[PDB]
Amino acid sequence: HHHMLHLLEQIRAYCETCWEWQEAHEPNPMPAPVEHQICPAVCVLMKLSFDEEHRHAMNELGGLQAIAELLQVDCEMYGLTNDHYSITLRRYAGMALTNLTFGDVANKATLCSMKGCMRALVAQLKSESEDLQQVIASVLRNLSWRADVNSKKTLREVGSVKALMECALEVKKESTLKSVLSALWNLSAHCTENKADICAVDGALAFLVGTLTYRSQTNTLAIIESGGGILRNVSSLIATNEDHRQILRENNCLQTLLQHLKSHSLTIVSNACGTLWNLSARNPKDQEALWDMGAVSMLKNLIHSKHKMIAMGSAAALRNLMANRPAKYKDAN
Amino acid sequence: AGESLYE
């Protein structure tokens, strides 16, 4: 913990020189992190941060604040027209911020209060380094989990929703998509504005429907779970917009949500019930489509679930269908 | 989705 003390000192000193140089310009050469051996200092701290005891130690020294200050000043100074040394420093800083925000109420609140830093994080979602995108999305995921009211407000105001959703459309790797969709699933639960901002991004809804049938090479359900959780969270709005329901229908959303009802993942089943609850309301064509696919018996099979949202959503969707039995069914016509 | 350590 002397070692940690020393590395944090190096970081704070470097930040202080950067802030002097910035403040020289208000009413010496520009500091370069390579000239202060910053990348190895944050690398070490990043490695230490995986251990719970080392994290407690870091927190007594304000490690989160100092590493956030570093990230923020480097982004301000060099933006996205930076070099590899700088991309590297931001990655290892971002990993550390992920580890330090995990489960940590104070650390989340502090970081979300740093508005400059929050803006810097969101800007990195467009980094040439997709791995850096993954790292930044991991931070945002943590910050969006159990966010207090000020932190929710900040996450929204810095444009994290639209940025993440745009990000998702361009990523090539599963790991990046997992972190991006997890952050978006958390964000989608905060407020209706966030739900609207997802639905507004051109191509998002189709993309999200696409994730419901993702073929993970790593024998996991993480992508289906997060993509379906976003969808279930935005379905209340989708239900109001015929254009949006149409996008869903013509990417085979409905037959997929019915197949989800049989999952071993309670998360997948719950997400599907919640989305069906909303999409089964009002629209006779979607009601009839669902009747024709045997939704009624499928939903009846879940109404006794121990899982409160599964039981609630299945029964609600079922009442929607049962109240609107299509004319062709009424023994005919 | 929940929170987590860097992966």
mmCIF file of C-alpha atoms in Angstrom, chain A residues 37-205:
data_model
loop_
_atom_site.group_PDB
_atom_site.id
_atom_site.type_symbol
_atom_site.label_atom_id
_atom_site.label_comp_id
_atom_site.label_asym_id
_atom_site.label_seq_id
_atom_site.Cartn_x
_atom_site.Cartn_y
_atom_site.Cartn_z
ATOM 1 C CA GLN A 37 5.502 7.397 -17.289
ATOM 2 C CA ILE A 38 1.723 7.481 -16.778
ATOM 3 C CA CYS A 39 0.750 4.403 -18.726
ATOM 4 C CA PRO A 40 2.618 1.972 -16.462
ATOM 5 C CA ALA A 41 1.430 3.697 -13.362
ATOM 6 C CA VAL A 42 -2.281 3.238 -14.301
ATOM 7 C CA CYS A 43 -1.558 -0.251 -15.609
ATOM 8 C CA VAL A 44 -0.364 -1.318 -12.144
ATOM 9 C CA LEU A 45 -3.286 0.339 -10.371
ATOM 10 C CA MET A 46 -5.665 -1.331 -12.867
ATOM 11 C CA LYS A 47 -4.182 -4.737 -12.042
ATOM 12 C CA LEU A 48 -4.428 -4.098 -8.308
ATOM 13 C CA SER A 49 -8.023 -3.005 -8.670
ATOM 14 C CA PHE A 50 -9.274 -6.542 -9.396
ATOM 15 C CA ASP A 51 -8.606 -7.547 -5.804
ATOM 16 C CA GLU A 52 -11.194 -6.526 -3.191
ATOM 17 C CA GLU A 53 -8.574 -5.716 -0.412
ATOM 18 C CA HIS A 54 -6.504 -3.619 -2.800
ATOM 19 C CA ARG A 55 -9.660 -1.759 -3.846
ATOM 20 C CA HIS A 56 -10.419 -0.854 -0.173
ATOM 21 C CA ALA A 57 -6.867 0.417 0.114
ATOM 22 C CA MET A 58 -7.232 2.479 -3.118
ATOM 23 C CA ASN A 59 -10.462 3.992 -1.875
ATOM 24 C CA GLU A 60 -8.773 5.322 1.335
ATOM 25 C CA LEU A 61 -6.492 7.294 -0.985
ATOM 26 C CA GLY A 62 -9.204 8.603 -3.260
ATOM 27 C CA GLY A 63 -8.045 6.289 -6.114
ATOM 28 C CA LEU A 64 -11.329 6.609 -8.016
ATOM 29 C CA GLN A 65 -11.244 10.373 -8.111
ATOM 30 C CA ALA A 66 -7.633 10.542 -9.107
ATOM 31 C CA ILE A 67 -7.880 7.997 -11.903
ATOM 32 C CA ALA A 68 -11.092 9.716 -13.171
ATOM 33 C CA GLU A 69 -9.349 13.112 -13.073
ATOM 34 C CA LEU A 70 -6.558 11.598 -15.222
ATOM 35 C CA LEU A 71 -8.876 10.173 -17.789
ATOM 36 C CA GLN A 72 -10.844 13.389 -17.974
ATOM 37 C CA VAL A 73 -7.741 15.664 -18.378
ATOM 38 C CA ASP A 74 -6.245 13.463 -21.063
ATOM 39 C CA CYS A 75 -9.514 13.489 -23.027
ATOM 40 C CA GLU A 76 -9.818 17.262 -22.716
ATOM 41 C CA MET A 77 -6.255 17.830 -23.744
ATOM 42 C CA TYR A 78 -5.990 15.518 -26.709
ATOM 43 C CA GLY A 79 -9.581 14.426 -27.464
ATOM 44 C CA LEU A 80 -10.062 11.730 -30.073
ATOM 45 C CA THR A 81 -7.098 13.018 -32.209
ATOM 46 C CA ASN A 82 -4.777 11.329 -29.714
ATOM 47 C CA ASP A 83 -2.001 8.687 -30.005
ATOM 48 C CA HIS A 84 -1.769 5.040 -28.880
ATOM 49 C CA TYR A 85 -0.108 5.891 -25.637
ATOM 50 C CA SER A 86 -3.176 7.943 -24.791
ATOM 51 C CA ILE A 87 -5.714 5.228 -25.993
ATOM 52 C CA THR A 88 -3.751 2.762 -23.816
ATOM 53 C CA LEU A 89 -3.841 5.025 -20.714
ATOM 54 C CA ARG A 90 -7.584 5.519 -21.155
ATOM 55 C CA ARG A 91 -8.221 1.787 -21.471
ATOM 56 C CA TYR A 92 -6.322 0.911 -18.240
ATOM 57 C CA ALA A 93 -7.904 3.892 -16.474
ATOM 58 C CA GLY A 94 -11.384 2.769 -17.687
ATOM 59 C CA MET A 95 -10.745 -0.845 -16.450
ATOM 60 C CA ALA A 96 -9.855 0.508 -13.076
ATOM 61 C CA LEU A 97 -12.950 2.770 -12.960
ATOM 62 C CA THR A 98 -15.020 -0.318 -13.799
ATOM 63 C CA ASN A 99 -13.519 -2.243 -10.909
ATOM 64 C CA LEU A 100 -13.835 0.631 -8.441
ATOM 65 C CA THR A 101 -17.459 1.442 -9.305
ATOM 66 C CA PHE A 102 -18.554 -2.189 -8.870
ATOM 67 C CA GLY A 103 -21.033 -2.371 -6.019
ATOM 68 C CA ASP A 104 -19.703 0.922 -4.622
ATOM 69 C CA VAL A 105 -22.328 3.549 -3.859
ATOM 70 C CA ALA A 106 -19.912 6.407 -3.073
ATOM 71 C CA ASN A 107 -17.672 5.727 -6.084
ATOM 72 C CA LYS A 108 -20.648 5.729 -8.436
ATOM 73 C CA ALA A 109 -21.971 8.925 -7.118
ATOM 74 C CA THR A 110 -18.612 10.654 -7.270
ATOM 75 C CA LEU A 111 -17.915 9.648 -10.866
ATOM 76 C CA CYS A 112 -21.422 10.640 -12.055
ATOM 77 C CA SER A 113 -20.932 14.042 -10.353
ATOM 78 C CA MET A 114 -17.841 14.642 -12.456
ATOM 79 C CA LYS A 115 -19.616 16.086 -15.422
ATOM 80 C CA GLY A 116 -16.523 16.758 -17.477
ATOM 81 C CA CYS A 117 -15.374 13.226 -16.922
ATOM 82 C CA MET A 118 -18.817 11.848 -17.816
ATOM 83 C CA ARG A 119 -18.707 13.753 -21.103
ATOM 84 C CA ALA A 120 -15.205 12.380 -21.735
ATOM 85 C CA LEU A 121 -16.438 8.807 -21.149
ATOM 86 C CA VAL A 122 -19.278 9.182 -23.568
ATOM 87 C CA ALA A 123 -16.988 10.627 -26.217
ATOM 88 C CA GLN A 124 -14.824 7.521 -26.092
ATOM 89 C CA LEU A 125 -17.660 5.414 -27.505
ATOM 90 C CA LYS A 126 -16.480 6.658 -30.909
ATOM 91 C CA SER A 127 -12.821 5.730 -30.316
ATOM 92 C CA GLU A 128 -10.983 4.036 -33.152
ATOM 93 C CA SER A 129 -10.236 1.350 -30.472
ATOM 94 C CA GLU A 130 -13.322 -0.833 -30.177
ATOM 95 C CA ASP A 131 -11.759 -2.439 -27.096
ATOM 96 C CA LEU A 132 -11.763 1.046 -25.489
ATOM 97 C CA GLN A 133 -15.473 1.283 -26.354
ATOM 98 C CA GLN A 134 -15.977 -1.965 -24.436
ATOM 99 C CA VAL A 135 -14.111 -0.675 -21.501
ATOM 100 C CA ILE A 136 -16.142 2.605 -21.401
ATOM 101 C CA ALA A 137 -19.381 0.735 -21.780
ATOM 102 C CA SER A 138 -18.383 -1.415 -18.780
ATOM 103 C CA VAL A 139 -17.984 1.752 -16.691
ATOM 104 C CA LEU A 140 -21.371 3.143 -17.847
ATOM 105 C CA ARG A 141 -23.065 -0.200 -17.063
ATOM 106 C CA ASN A 142 -21.883 0.024 -13.413
ATOM 107 C CA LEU A 143 -22.796 3.665 -13.103
ATOM 108 C CA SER A 144 -26.309 2.958 -14.488
ATOM 109 C CA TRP A 145 -26.950 0.183 -11.972
ATOM 110 C CA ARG A 146 -28.847 1.448 -8.956
ATOM 111 C CA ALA A 147 -27.985 5.055 -9.913
ATOM 112 C CA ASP A 148 -29.345 7.701 -7.569
ATOM 113 C CA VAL A 149 -31.497 10.505 -8.820
ATOM 114 C CA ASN A 150 -28.563 12.945 -9.515
ATOM 115 C CA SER A 151 -26.545 10.211 -11.236
ATOM 116 C CA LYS A 152 -29.591 9.287 -13.460
ATOM 117 C CA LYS A 153 -29.931 12.838 -14.398
ATOM 118 C CA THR A 154 -26.293 13.168 -15.311
ATOM 119 C CA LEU A 155 -26.161 9.920 -17.349
ATOM 120 C CA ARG A 156 -29.073 11.205 -19.373
ATOM 121 C CA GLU A 157 -27.819 14.795 -19.812
ATOM 122 C CA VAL A 158 -24.452 13.709 -21.144
ATOM 123 C CA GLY A 159 -26.169 11.817 -23.922
ATOM 124 C CA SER A 160 -25.117 8.271 -22.851
ATOM 125 C CA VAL A 161 -28.240 6.647 -24.257
ATOM 126 C CA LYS A 162 -28.056 7.813 -27.796
ATOM 127 C CA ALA A 163 -24.296 7.310 -27.758
ATOM 128 C CA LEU A 164 -24.487 3.710 -26.591
ATOM 129 C CA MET A 165 -27.267 2.824 -28.925
ATOM 130 C CA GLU A 166 -25.369 4.285 -31.889
ATOM 131 C CA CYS A 167 -22.258 2.462 -30.646
ATOM 132 C CA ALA A 168 -24.072 -0.879 -30.595
ATOM 133 C CA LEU A 169 -24.948 -0.633 -34.289
ATOM 134 C CA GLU A 170 -21.243 -0.422 -35.305
ATOM 135 C CA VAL A 171 -19.566 -2.934 -32.926
ATOM 136 C CA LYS A 172 -17.993 -6.141 -34.367
ATOM 137 C CA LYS A 173 -17.332 -8.115 -31.240
ATOM 138 C CA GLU A 174 -19.553 -9.953 -28.878
ATOM 139 C CA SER A 175 -17.615 -8.677 -25.854
ATOM 140 C CA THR A 176 -18.153 -5.059 -26.878
ATOM 141 C CA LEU A 177 -21.863 -5.728 -27.614
ATOM 142 C CA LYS A 178 -22.337 -7.413 -24.210
ATOM 143 C CA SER A 179 -20.998 -4.450 -22.310
ATOM 144 C CA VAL A 180 -22.889 -1.929 -24.549
ATOM 145 C CA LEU A 181 -26.282 -3.716 -24.348
ATOM 146 C CA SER A 182 -25.892 -4.217 -20.555
ATOM 147 C CA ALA A 183 -25.396 -0.486 -20.054
ATOM 148 C CA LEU A 184 -28.385 0.226 -22.316
ATOM 149 C CA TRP A 185 -30.556 -2.329 -20.448
ATOM 150 C CA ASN A 186 -29.765 -0.481 -17.201
ATOM 151 C CA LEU A 187 -30.301 2.926 -18.712
ATOM 152 C CA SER A 188 -33.562 1.909 -20.386
ATOM 153 C CA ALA A 189 -35.164 1.413 -16.870
ATOM 154 C CA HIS A 190 -34.363 4.935 -15.579
ATOM 155 C CA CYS A 191 -37.035 7.014 -17.273
ATOM 156 C CA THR A 192 -39.256 7.343 -20.329
ATOM 157 C CA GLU A 193 -36.938 9.852 -21.991
ATOM 158 C CA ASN A 194 -34.234 7.198 -22.095
ATOM 159 C CA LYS A 195 -36.767 4.716 -23.606
ATOM 160 C CA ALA A 196 -37.690 7.311 -26.276
ATOM 161 C CA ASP A 197 -34.016 8.053 -27.103
ATOM 162 C CA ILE A 198 -33.366 4.352 -27.836
ATOM 163 C CA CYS A 199 -36.393 4.066 -30.055
ATOM 164 C CA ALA A 200 -35.376 7.295 -31.937
ATOM 165 C CA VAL A 201 -32.016 6.022 -33.214
ATOM 166 C CA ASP A 202 -32.484 4.889 -36.860
ATOM 167 C CA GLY A 203 -32.129 1.087 -37.094
ATOM 168 C CA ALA A 204 -32.109 0.481 -33.326
ATOM 169 C CA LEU A 205 -35.367 -1.364 -33.057
#
